Structure 1
Amino acid sequence: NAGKMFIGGLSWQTSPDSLRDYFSKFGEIRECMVMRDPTTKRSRGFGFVTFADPASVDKVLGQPHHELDSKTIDPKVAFPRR
């Protein structure tokens, strides 16, 4: 549904509060989660954000660069299928 985004490339050290704190700069956030890639303890992880205002997604995508915990992260519109 609306307002949801899937984010790739998170540092292995990025916490959910680091993910929430960065993305709060484009709007209020309903739900936020980080999932580690366990192939290594030093592997890039994945993030999920659910914005309160679905216009927040637009604000995110209008940036050319996104950086978090010194890694370039890759926010995408989420396309879930249960």
Structure 2
Amino acid sequence: GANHFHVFVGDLSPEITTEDIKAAFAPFGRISDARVVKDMATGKSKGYGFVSFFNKWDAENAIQQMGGQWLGGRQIRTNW
């Protein structure tokens, strides 16, 4: 169907899950999908995740606003 606008999130704490990373990016707008990439073998957090918004003037906010903000005792990268 119609494509969404995907936001990369780097430097996540290993304790961070799909539940709380969705809660951190919910204040900007509604989320079509969000997840933290786990390793297929072990199941621990790889370090990064994705958050896809419906609107672009929304992900654009989420990238600029969260660029270096603390989440789980670690500053995060944000980009497309």
TM-score, structure 2 as length reference: 0.76
CA shift at 1:36, angstroms? Answer: 3.5
Change (3 A) 1:72 1:44: farther
Q: Indicate the percent of aligned positions where both proteins have the same amino acid.
A: 27
How large is the Cα RMSD of the aligned pairs?
2.4
Structure with bigger strand share is: 1
Structure 2 stretches lacking a partner, 5+ long:
none
Partner in structure 2 of residue 75 of structure 1: 78
Structure 1 stretches lacking a partner, 5+ long:
78-82
Instruction: Count the aligned residue pairs.
Output: 76
The ranges of structure 1 where at least 4 consecutive aligned residues each deviate by more than 4 angstroms after the TM superposition are: none
**Structure 2 residue 10 is the aligned partner of structure 1 residue 8:** yes
Change (3 A) 1:33 1:54: same
